[PDB]
Amino acid sequence: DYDGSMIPAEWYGWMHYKTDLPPIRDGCRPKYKWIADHSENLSGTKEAYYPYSTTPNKVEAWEPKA
Amino acid sequence: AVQQVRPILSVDREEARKRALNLYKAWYRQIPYIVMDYDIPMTVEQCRDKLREEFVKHRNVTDIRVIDMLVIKGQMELKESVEIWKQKGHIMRYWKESQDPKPTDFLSKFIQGV
Amino acid sequence: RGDIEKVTHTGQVFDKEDYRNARFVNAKRYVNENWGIKLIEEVPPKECTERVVFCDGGDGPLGHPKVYINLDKPGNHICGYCGLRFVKK
Amino acid sequence: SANYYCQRDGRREVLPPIDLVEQQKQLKLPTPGKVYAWD
Amino acid sequence: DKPTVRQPDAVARSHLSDFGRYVAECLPKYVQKVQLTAGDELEVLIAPEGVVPVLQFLKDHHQAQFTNLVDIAGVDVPCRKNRFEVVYNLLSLRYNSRIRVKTYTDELTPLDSACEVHKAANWYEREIWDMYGVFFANHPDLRRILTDYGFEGHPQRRDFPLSGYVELRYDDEKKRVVCEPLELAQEFRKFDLSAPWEQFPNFRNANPP
Amino acid sequence: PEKIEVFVDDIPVQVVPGTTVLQAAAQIGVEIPRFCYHERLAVAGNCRMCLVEVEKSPKPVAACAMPVMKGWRIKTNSDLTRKAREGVMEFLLMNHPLDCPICDQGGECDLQDQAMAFGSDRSRFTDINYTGKRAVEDKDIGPLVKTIMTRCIHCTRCVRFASEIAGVDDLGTTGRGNDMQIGTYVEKLFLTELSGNVIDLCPVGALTNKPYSFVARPWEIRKVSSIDVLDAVGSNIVVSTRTNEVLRILPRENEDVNEEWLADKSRFACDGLKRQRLVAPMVRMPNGELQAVEWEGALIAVAKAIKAAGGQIAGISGQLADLEAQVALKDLLNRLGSEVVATEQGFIAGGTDNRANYLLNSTIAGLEEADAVLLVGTNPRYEAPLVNTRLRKAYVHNELQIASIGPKIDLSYDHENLGADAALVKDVCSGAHAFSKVLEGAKKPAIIIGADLLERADGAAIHATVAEYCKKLKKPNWNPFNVLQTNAAQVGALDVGYKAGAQTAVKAQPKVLFLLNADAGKVTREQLPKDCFVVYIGSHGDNGASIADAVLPGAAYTEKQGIYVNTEGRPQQTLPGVSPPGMAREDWKILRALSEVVGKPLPYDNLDELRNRLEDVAPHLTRLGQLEPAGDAGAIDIKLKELRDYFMTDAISRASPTMAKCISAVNKQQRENEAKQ
Amino acid sequence: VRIHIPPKNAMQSGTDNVNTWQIEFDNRERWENPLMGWASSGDPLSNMNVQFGSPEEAITFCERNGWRWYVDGAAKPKKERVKNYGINFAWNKRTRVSTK
Amino acid sequence: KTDDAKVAPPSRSEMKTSMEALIHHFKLFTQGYQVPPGATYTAIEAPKGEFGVY
Amino acid sequence: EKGPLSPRFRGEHALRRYPSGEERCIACKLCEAICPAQAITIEAEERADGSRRTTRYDIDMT
Numbered sequence A: 001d002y003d004g005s006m007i008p009a010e011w012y013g014w015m016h017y018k019t020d021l022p023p024i025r026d027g028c029r030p031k032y033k034w035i036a037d038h039s040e041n042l043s044g045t046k047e048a049y050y051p052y053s054t055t056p057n058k059v060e061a062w063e064p065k066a
Numbered sequence B: 001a002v003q004q005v006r007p008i009l010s011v012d013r014e015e016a017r018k019r020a021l022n023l024y025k026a027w028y029r030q031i032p033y034i035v036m037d038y039d040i041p042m043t044v045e046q047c048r049d050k051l052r053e054e055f056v057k058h059r060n061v062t063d064i065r066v067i068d069m070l071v072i073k074g075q076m077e078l079k080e081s082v083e084i085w086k087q088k089g090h091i092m093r094y095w096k097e098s099q100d101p102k103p104t105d106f107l108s109k110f111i112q113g114v
Numbered sequence C: 001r002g003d004i005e006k007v008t009h010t011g012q013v014f015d016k017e018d019y020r021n022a023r024f025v026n027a028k029r030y031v032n033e034n035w036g037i038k039l040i041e042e043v044p045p046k047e048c049t050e051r052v053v054f055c056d057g058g059d060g061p062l063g064h065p066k067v068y069i070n071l072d073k074p075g076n077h078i079c080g081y082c083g084l085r086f087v088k089k
Numbered sequence D: 001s002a003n004y005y006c007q008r009d010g011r012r013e014v015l016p017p018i019d020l021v022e023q024q025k026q027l028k029l030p031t032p033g034k035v036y037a038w039d
Numbered sequence E: 001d002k003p004t005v006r007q008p009d010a011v012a013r014s015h016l017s018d019f020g021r022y023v024a025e026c027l028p029k030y031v032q033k034v035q036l037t038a039g040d041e042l043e044v045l046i047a048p049e050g051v052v053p054v055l056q057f058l059k060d061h062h063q064a065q066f067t068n069l070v071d072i073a074g075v076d077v078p079c080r081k082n083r084f085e086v087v088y089n090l091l092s093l094r095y096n097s098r099i100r101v102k103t104y105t106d107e108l109t110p111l112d113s114a115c116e117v118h119k120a121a122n123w124y125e126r127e128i129w130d131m132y133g134v135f136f137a138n139h140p141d142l143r144r145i146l147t148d149y150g151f152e153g154h155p156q157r158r159d160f161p162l163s164g165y166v167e168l169r170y171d172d173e174k175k176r177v178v179c180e181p182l183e184l185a186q187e188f189r190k191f192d193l194s195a196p197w198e199q200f201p202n203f204r205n206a207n208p209p
Numbered sequence F: 001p002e003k004i005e006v007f008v009d010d011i012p013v014q015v016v017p018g019t020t021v022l023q024a025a026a027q028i029g030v031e032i033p034r035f036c037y038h039e040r041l042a043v044a045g046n047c048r049m050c051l052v053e054v055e056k057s058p059k060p061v062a063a064c065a066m067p068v069m070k071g072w073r074i075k076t077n078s079d080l081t082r083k084a085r086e087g088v089m090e091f092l093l094m095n096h097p098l099d100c101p102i103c104d105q106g107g108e109c110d111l112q113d114q115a116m117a118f119g120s121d122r123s124r125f126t127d128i129n130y131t132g133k134r135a136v137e138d139k140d141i142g143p144l145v146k147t148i149m150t151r152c153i154h155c156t157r158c159v160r161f162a163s164e165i166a167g168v169d170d171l172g173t174t175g176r177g178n179d180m181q182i183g184t185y186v187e188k189l190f191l192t193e194l195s196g197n198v199i200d201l202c203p204v205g206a207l208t209n210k211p212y213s214f215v216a217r218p219w220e221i222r223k224v225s226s227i228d229v230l231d232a233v234g235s236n237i238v239v240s241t242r243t244n245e246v247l248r249i250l251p252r253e254n255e256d257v258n259e260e261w262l263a264d265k266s267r268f269a270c271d272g273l274k275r276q277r278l279v280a281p282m283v284r285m286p287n288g289e290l291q292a293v294e295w296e297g298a299l300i301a302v303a304k305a306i307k308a309a310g311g312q313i314a315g316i317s318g319q320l321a322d323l324e325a326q327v328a329l330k331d332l333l334n335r336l337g338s339e340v341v342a343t344e345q346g347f348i349a350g351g352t353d354n355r356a357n358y359l360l361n362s363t364i365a366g367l368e369e370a371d372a373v374l375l376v377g378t379n380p381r382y383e384a385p386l387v388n389t390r391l392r393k394a395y396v397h398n399e400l401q402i403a404s405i406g407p408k409i410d411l412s413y414d415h416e417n418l419g420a421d422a423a424l425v426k427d428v429c430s431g432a433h434a435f436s437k438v439l440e441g442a443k444k445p446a447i448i449i450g451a452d453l454l455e456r457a458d459g460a461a462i463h464a465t466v467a468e469y470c471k472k473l474k475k476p477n478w479n480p481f482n483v484l485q486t487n488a489a490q491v492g493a494l495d496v497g498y499k500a501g502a503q504t505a506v507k508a509q510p511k512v513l514f515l516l517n518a519d520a521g522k523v524t525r526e527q528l529p530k531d532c533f534v535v536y537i538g539s540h541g542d543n544g545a546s547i548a549d550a551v552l553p554g555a556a557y558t559e560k561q562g563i564y565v566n567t568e569g570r571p572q573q574t575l576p577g578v579s580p581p582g583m584a585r586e587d588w589k590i591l592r593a594l595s596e597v598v599g600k601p602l603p604y605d606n607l608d609e610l611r612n613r614l615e616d617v618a619p620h621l622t623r624l625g626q627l628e629p630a631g632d633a634g635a636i637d638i639k640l641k642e643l644r645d646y647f648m649t650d651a652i653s654r655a656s657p658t659m660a661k662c663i664s665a666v667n668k669q670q671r672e673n674e675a676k677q
Numbered sequence G: 001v002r003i004h005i006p007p008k009n010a011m012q013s014g015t016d017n018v019n020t021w022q023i024e025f026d027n028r029e030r031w032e033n034p035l036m037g038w039a040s041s042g043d044p045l046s047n048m049n050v051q052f053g054s055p056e057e058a059i060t061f062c063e064r065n066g067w068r069w070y071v072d073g074a075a076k077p078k079k080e081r082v083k084n085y086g087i088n089f090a091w092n093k094r095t096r097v098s099t100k
Numbered sequence H: 001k002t003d004d005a006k007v008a009p010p011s012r013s014e015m016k017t018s019m020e021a022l023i024h025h026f027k028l029f030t031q032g033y034q035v036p037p038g039a040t041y042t043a044i045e046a047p048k049g050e051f052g053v054y
Numbered sequence I: 001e002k003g004p005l006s007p008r009f010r011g012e013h014a015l016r017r018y019p020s021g022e023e024r025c026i027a028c029k030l031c032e033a034i035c036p037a038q039a040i041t042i043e044a045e046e047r048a049d050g051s052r053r054t055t056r057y058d059i060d061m062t
C-alpha cells in the first residue's frame, strides 16, 4: 500500500531534490509544539475529509416560549 | 419619428411577409426528415405544432428590419437542422422538456416562495 | 462519533437534530486542536523600559510589517498582527 | 535625491490621439514607412 | 535621461503622420477623420459605406499596398447610438507598417462584407456576426462559428450577462443533455474597482463637443 | 455681484467674488486633492495638500482657503504643483503606522487613494532603522467609535464637526509639535445622536465604526441605495450588502433631506435586523403556546376567524409599516366591508382633511434659512436629529432666534424657555408675550410643534391657534406652520385615508384585529374583547407578537421595496438589499394572499399593479423624490427628552445588541460620575 | 431596470467615480448554499451593470431592448456655497469658532 | 522589474518596512493600476505565427 | 524515486501560523481580491480577544 504521500515533510524536500541536505544534516528545521505527524491521503475511506461551513448562523429567530 | 436606414434583405413589408412564408414552407417540408434522422420522442404532428406555436411568438413584430433578422436567424437554424450539425439534444431544446411548469396563480407562487 | 459534537474554535457546530450531520456518517469532521486563541494567551508578555517598542513578527522579512506600540497606558498592549503582548514597568 | 516621480513617471505623459488633418490647419509621395524587400 | 519612460519612435511617427494625411485627400467621400494614436499607430475613421472602397484602396494603391489583413475586432459600446464598432488591422509587408480602419454600425444596419478585398475576412466576419450580432451583407455564408448550435443571443455584447441564462446537465430520464435556467452555487462576486480620484488629467478636458 | 474672470489651467471661468480657488476649479471639473477641507465644515488650512501654483506669486497658495482674485492663472497640473503634493505625501506618510492590512479604511482610504494619484512611489524615510516612527496612545471614546489614534493625520475634521455640527465641544487638540494629539484630555464618552458621522469624516482609519469592525472590505460590498425608516426624516441611505447580509448603513448624499449626515439610530439599526426575527408562521394552539406552521395552514387558520368574525374587523398600522402594505390592509378590510382602519399614533380629529395639517410645510432644507423658530413640546435634538442639525446651521449662520414651550432641555445651542404652561401658546398667539414680537418681525418665522402634543387631548385647540397664527406670519412663498412627525408610517397612513389613534380600533370591539408591524405597547390583550383573534404581521417578534394569536412573518425594510413618506411629504422608495430570512414574505404579499383564502381577490397581483392603485388614491404619491406644496393649514410634557431614551424606541432598535451597549455605556458613566462626587 | 447615478462613497471625498449613469436590475433572491454556505442565486441579470452618459441615452437603450425602466431623480446641481475663511473669526456673529 | 511601484509591485522586504511600499502593494493587488485610455495592437513572432492582442 | 522539483513549486495550499502558534492570517482579504478564479471566500469577525481574524476561509480547489 505504499503511496507517494507517505513521505513525511522532514524528508520531503530532500526527496524531491529541493535541497541537497538531509534533515539530520541541517539544523534549520523547526520543532514547534503544534506540528502534526504525517498522514496519508485518505480518500474513499471512513477517515476522509468532508467540508462544512465554519460560521455559526447569523440571524437569530425569536423564541415564543420565552 | 422616422429615419433613413439601409435595408437588411427586403424593402417592403410585403416582401418581408413573402420571405417569412418561405421559411415556413422549408420547415414544414423538413419535419418528416427531422423525425427520422433524430432519436427524439416527438412526432411530426407534435413538431408541426411547435413550428406553428413559435411563428406565433413573434405575432406583434412590425419593423421590417426586425422581421429580416428573425428570418436570417430562422433560416440559419434550418440549415443547421437540414444538416445534422445540431445534435439530438439541440432539437429537443425547442420544447424545454426538462423545465417543469411553474404555477402562475398568486396563491401557489406565494406558498412555493419566490 | 466524538468529532460530530465537537465545537470548533470559530464557535460553530451542527445541532444534534440538524440533518446536515448526515454528511459525516461516512466521513470525519477534523476540528483543529491547536486553537490560536489559547496558544497566544499562553505566551507571557514582554516587559520593556522604553516608552515605545516595535514588533515585526520576530523574523524581519519573514514576519509581519513593522508596527510600533505606545506603552504609556498601564495595561499590557497587544500587537495587531501577531497578538504578542507588551508592557512597560 | 532628485528622484521626483513627476519626471520619471510615464503614465501621466501620454496625451490623447492627435488629429492629423487639423493639426496642420492649426499649424516623393508619402508612404506608410520604409520599403522592404519581401519579394 | 529617464529610463522608465518608453522612448517614442519619431522616425516611424513622422512617416505615419504624412501618409495619414495622404489618405485623407484620396478618399474625401468616406474618411471622416484620421488620427495618430499615442502608441504611434495610425487610425482611419471611415463612414459605414466606405468599408469596401477604403479597404480596396489601401490594398491596391502603390503607396499603400496593405496587402495583409490581420484582424477584424468588434467593440460594443452601449452609450453610443451606433453601439457596435468594427476595427480592421492591416499590415503592409512591402512598407513594413500597420494601419487601423474603424467603422460604426447599429444593431440592425448591415455592414458591407470585405471578403472581396481580403478574403481572409471570411471567418473574422463570421465571428463578428456570432459574437456581437453585426450582420454582414453579401457574405458567402454567414453562420455562427464559435457559440453552441442553437445558442440564442450574442454573448459579447456588454448587455449580456456573464454567465448566460442557461446551463447544461444530463437528465437520465431523457437519456440526453438538457438545458435549464442558470443556477450558480456561488455567485460571481463583483468588485467595485473604481478610483475616486482622477489620475490622468490630460484626458479630463479631451474631446470637446 | 458681477462674475470675476479667472483661468484655471488656462481655461477661463466665471465666479462670484469671494469664491475659493478650490471651488473655482470645481466648476471646470478639476478636483484638487484635500484632507482638511470639507464642504460642510469650517475652512481650515492644516493639511496643506490643496496647495496650488498661481502665476507670478512668491509661493503656493492653499486652494481651500484662498479667495479668488481677478485675472489669476491657477496652475493645477504644473511641475511646481506636482512637487508640492509629492512633498506633503512624503510628509504625511512618515509616521502613519503601516496598518493597511488591519485597518478598516483599507480600500476606502483617502490617504491611500491620494497617495497613488499624487504622492511619490518611493520612501526616503531612512530613519525607520534608527529611531522608528511615532506611536500614540489610544483613546476610549465609547461603545460606538473605535479609536486608533496612531493613524490620525491631524486633519481636525473630527474636532470641527463636533464643535460646529453636533455642538458638543468635548473633543479637541492637546499638545504641540509631533506630540500633538486629538481627543478628550480626561476619558469621557462622546455621547451624541450624531456621533456616528465622525466615523465618515475621519479620512483615515483613526476613528472607525466599532460594531462593524473587520466585518468586510469595500471592494466586496454591493451598494444598495435605500432610505431609513427608524426616523421620520426619511434620510437617504446606502445599505452595504455582501452575500445576503447587511453589513453597515452609510449616508447617501441628498441636499434636500439628508445632507450627508445620519443620526445614530439609523446608522446602528443594522444589528437589530439580525435578532429576534420572525422566521415562520406561528399559531396559538388550544393549550396556549405558539407553534410554527406552514403558510397554507396559517392563512387558512386566519381565514376561519375572518369568516366567523362577520365584519367586525379592525386594523392598526404600526411604526415601521409600509405604504404599499398599508394600502393592501385597507383594501382587504374594505372588501370585507369593514372600515375601522387606524394607526397607532393619535392625532387631531378631522386633521386628515388638509395635507398641510400634518407635515413640515417648511421643507427640511427651508428651515436652515429660518430666522425665528418656536418649538412647542418638541425636542428635535432627539425626536428628529437631522432637523436639529439644520436649526443649528441657521443658528450659527442665519442668526436664528429660538424659543421653547415645555420642559427644560438642551438643544446643542442657546434657546429661551418660555415655560411649560399650556396657556403660553395662546399667549404667544395673542401677541401679548414678549417673544411674539420676534416672530412677527422676522423675514422667515416658523413654528414647529411635536406630533406627540397634537395626539394629546388638548391638541385640537393648540393645533387651531398656531395654525390660525401662522396665517398672520405667512409670507410670500413661506409656510410657517410645521408639524414634526416621528414615524415613517404615520404620514403615509393619513395620506391614504387611515383614521388616527389606536383607540379608533378598540372602540369597535372587533372580533379580529390586524397588527401590521404595530409593536408599540399601545394595545394590550386586556383591552381586547375576550373573544378576539389578534393577527400580527411584522418582522420582529416583540410585545406586539407576544399577544398575537397568529403571527405571520413579514420582511424588514431592507428586504422589501416599499414607499415611505417622510415628514415633509417626500415619497421615497426602499430597495431590497437582502433576501428575507426563513419563510418570511413581504407584508403586502401576505394580505394579497390572505384575500384568496377568504375569497375576495384584490385587484392587483404585482407591485406595479399595486402602485397604480396608489396612483388613483393620491397622484402625488407616485412622483418619487418630489414635493407638492400644501399651501395653507386649517402643562406640555414630552417623551424622549433624555439620550438614554433615544436608542430604544423601535422594535428594530430595541432588538439591537449595539444599542444595549450604548444604553449601558451612558448609564455606566452616570453611575461613576456621582460615585466620585 | 433602475437608471441611476452610482452613489458617492460617503467615506471618501473623491467624485470621479460618480461621473456616469448606470443601469442595475432588480435585486432578486439569494440563499445560503446547502453544502458550504456560500451565497447562491439563479439570477443571471442580477450581476449586470452598464454605463451611460445621460438618462436620455439610458432610456433610449432600455426602450430598444424591451426592458421596463424607471429613472431615479437626477441629483440637482449643488447650490453655491460661500465657504469664507475670515468669518471663522467674527466680532459679533455666532460663526466664530471656539476651536482651531 | 521597472522601478515604478505604481505599475509593478514593490519588494516584499520593502513592503514590511516602508509605508509607501505597503500602500502601493495594497492598491496594486486590490484595485490594480490604472491604464490611460487608449487602444493598441502589439504583435510578436510567436512560434505558431503572428500573435496579436488588440 | 521522484522529483526533481524546485523550492518555488506551487502546490496544495496551507495557512501558516507564527511560532507562537497564533494563525498568521488577519483577514486582510488581499488574497480574495486578487484570486483570478475567485476561488477564495473569507468572512472575518472581531475575535473574543479582540484580534482581527477569520471565522471562515474556504478555497475551492476545483
Ligand code: SF4
Pocket (backbone or CB within 6 Å): F096, F097, F098, F099, F100, F101, F103, F104, F105, F106, F107, F109, F110, F111, F112, F151, F203, F204, F205, F206, H023
Ligand atoms: S488610514 Fe488605514 S488604510 Fe489608510 S493608509 Fe492609514 S493604515 Fe492604510
Ligand code: SF4
Pocket (backbone or CB within 6 Å): F151, F152, F153, F154, F155, F156, F157, F158, F159, F182, F201, F202, F203, F204, F206, F207
Ligand atoms: S482623528 Fe481623524 S478626523 Fe480627527 S484630526 Fe485625526 S485624522 Fe482628522
Ligand code: SF4
Pocket (backbone or CB within 6 Å): I024, I025, I026, I027, I028, I029, I030, I031, I032, I042
Ligand atoms: S486574508 Fe488572505 S492575504 Fe490577508 S492575511 Fe489572510 S491569507 Fe493573507
Ligand code: FES
Pocket (backbone or CB within 6 Å): F033, F034, F035, F036, F037, F044, F045, F046, F047, F048, F049, F050, F051, F062, F063, F064, F065
Ligand atoms: S485642504 Fe487646504 S490645507 Fe487642507
Ligand code: NA
Pocket (backbone or CB within 6 Å): F105, F199, F200, F201, F202, F203, F204, F205, F206, F207, F208
Ligand atoms: Na474613518
Ligand SMILES: [Zn+2]
Pocket (backbone or CB within 6 Å): C055, C056, C057, C064, C079, C080, C081, C082, C083, C084
Ligand atoms: Zn507583531
